[PDB]
């Protein structure tokens, strides 16, 4: 995306991070960005 590219890669999705080193596949809070572009963040602001 042209408007705010650095926010749509660092962070990416509207689901917040919870990353624990003890767990291998960390699916706590954040769902893994698929696809990483404008996507669900643009639809939640209405765009």
């Amino acid at each position: 995306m042209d408007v705010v590219d650095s926010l749509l890669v660092n962070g990416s999705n509207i689901t917040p991070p919870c990353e624990l080193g003890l767990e291998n596949e960390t699916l706590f809070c954040l769902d893994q960005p698929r696809p990483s572009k404008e996507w669900q963040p643009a639809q939640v602001i209405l765009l």
Binding site: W39, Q43, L46
Partner: peptide, 8 residues
């Protein structure tokens, strides 16, 4: 689909 909820 993500572009789909409001595709307009």
């Amino acid at each position: 689909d993500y572009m789909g909820w409001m595709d307009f």
